[PDB]
Write a protein that binds this ligand. Structure first.
Ligand SMILES: CCC[C@@]1(CCc2ccccc2)CC(O)=C([C@@H](CC)c2cccc(NS(=O)(=O)c3ccc(C(F)(F)F)cn3)c2)C(=O)O1
Lengths: 99, 99
């Protein structure tokens, strides 16, 4: 659909059999979610943002349903303050910025 | 313009006569720029990011040109890893998320 920016661009996602709420963040290269259990092996990684770095666990080839939209891609799990859907999966669902 | 996200959504801003590179970020509510001087008095503000909170310098009614569009609102100045343009100014340029 079309999303205006008067409010935070919050969407519901589905992952690991858990329905969740996320932020569509176009400034994020990656997708970071609050702590959770995902299947398969993961690697430790460090991602920075406003505030500095947080250690995260990186899961690859993950299926996510955003706005009833399937998408597969890398997902990082860690001590994030908020769930954030990055460009990494935003491209996959054809998201653009218009103005 | 219509901006895709396979690349960072970097744009050129004109701020205080200087051209700068900023990021269009729907995930941020406010505009946070790298350390720089600006006119007037500033109020203090604490902002939370992915990796923690940071104090910043709040500046109101600042003139910022983003891709030719003229905006005038609040600008946070602080230790940010990158110049970020938030919802406060995106709503001003009439920026939406499409899909
Ligand atoms: C201005 C703060 C808002 C925000 C955090 C979001 C938030 C929203 C509501 C409540 C709580 C938190 C959103 C934002 O886009 C990021 C950024 C960097 C600008 C961000 C977000 C997610 C991941 C990262 N790590 S990264 O490797 O994907 C990365 C690293 C750097 C860049 C750069 F282009 F921003 F430098 C972008 N992405 C960074 C952030 O660090 O804080």
């Amino acid at each position: 659909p079309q999303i205006t920016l008067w409010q935070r661009p919050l969407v519901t996602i589905k992952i690991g059999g858990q329905l969740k709420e996320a932020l569509l963040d176009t400034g994020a290269d990656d997708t970071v979610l609050e702590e959770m259990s995902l299947p398969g092996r993961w690697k430790p990684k460090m991602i920075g943002g406003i505030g500095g770095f947080i250690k995260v666990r990186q899961y690859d080839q993950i299926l996510i349903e955003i706005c009833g939209h399937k998408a597969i891609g890398t997902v990082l799990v860690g001590p994030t303050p908020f769930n954030v859907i990055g460009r990494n999966l935003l491209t996959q669902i054809g998201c653009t910025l218009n103005f």
